[PDB]
Structure 1
Amino acid sequence: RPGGDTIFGKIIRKEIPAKIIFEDDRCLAFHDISPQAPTHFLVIPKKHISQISVAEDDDESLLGHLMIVGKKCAADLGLNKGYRMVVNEGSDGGQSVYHVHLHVLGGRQMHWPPG
C-alpha cells in the first residue's frame, strides 16, 4: 500500500487523524501526539522506508527533502530561537515506529547530551 502498514501509513492515507502542518508529493509533516517540547513535529516520507539503516543510496534526495521541509516548517511555526532535529534508529535509538521520520523539537532550551 502507498505509505506502508505502520500507523504513519494510515496517517498518510488519511485513515486516522493527524494535525498536518505541510504536505507534498514526497512527504508529510504533522504534530507529535506525545510532544517532548512546546513544539514537536515529525516529517515523514510518503514512500515507506522502515528505518534509516536500510535507506538506499538513491533515497538521498528524499532524506534531504525531509530536512529542508523540517527547517521550513520550523520557520513557519515561529521557532526563531532554534530547534533540534532527531532520527531514532533501532533499539538503542529508542525507535518505536518503523517508518523513517525526522523529529523537530523547539520552543524551549534543548539540553546536552541529546538523550
Structure 2
Amino acid sequence: GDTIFGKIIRKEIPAKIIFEDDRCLAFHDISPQAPTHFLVIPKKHISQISVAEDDDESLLGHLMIVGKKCAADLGLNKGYRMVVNEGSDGGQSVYHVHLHVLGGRQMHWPPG
C-alpha cells in the first residue's frame, strides 16, 4: 500500500529535497536525530529490505552512493552513519525502503 514516502516522491506533500534523479530521491528527515539527518529512497516501491530482489542490487547500491555524495555535499567531512531498518525489531517506521544518513555529531555505540 501507499505510504507518506510515496506522497513525497509524487510531490503531493512538501519535503526539503537534497537530490533527485530518475530512480531515487534524497530529502531531510522530518524528525532529525543529528544536526544532519536525511533519507535516500528509491522511486520503486520496495516495502522493506527483506523483500528486495536480486535485480535490485544496483539500485540499492545507488542509494548508498547517492547518500555518500550528498553527505559530502552537506559538509559531513568528519563522517556519518548509514542505517536501514527492517521490521518491528529494526524500528522500521515507513514500509518503503529508506536509507538514513546521520552526521554532524559523534554517533555512539551500540547503534540503538
TM-score range normalised by the length of the shorter chain: over 0.9
Question: What is the alpha-carbon distance in structure 1 between the residues aligned to residue 93 and residue 8 of structure 2?
Answer: 16
* Percent identity between the two aligned chains: 100
Aligned to 2:20: 23
Unaligned 5+ runs, structure 1:
none
1:36 is the counterpart of 2:44: no
Q: CA separation in 1, counterparts of 2:49 and 2:87?
A: 9
The answer on 1:56 being equivalent to 2:67 is: no
Structure 2 SS opposite 1:11: helix
- The 2-side partners of 1:59 and 1:69 are apart by 15
Give the structure 2 partner of residue 67 of structure 1: 64
CA deviations on 1:56-92 (whole Å, 9 max, x unpaired) are: 0000000000000000000000000000000000000
**How far is 1:96 from its partner?**
1.2
Length-normalised TM-score, structure 1: 0.96
Total equivalences in the alignment: 112
TM-score by length of 2: 0.99
Gaps of 5+ in 2: none
Once superposed, which parts of structure 1, at least 4 consecutive aligned residues long, lie more than 4 Å away?
none
Instruction: Give secondary structure in 2 for the equivalent of 1:74.
Output: helix
Summarize deviations over 1:19-65 as a string: whole Å, max 9, x none: 00000001000000000000000000000000000000000000000
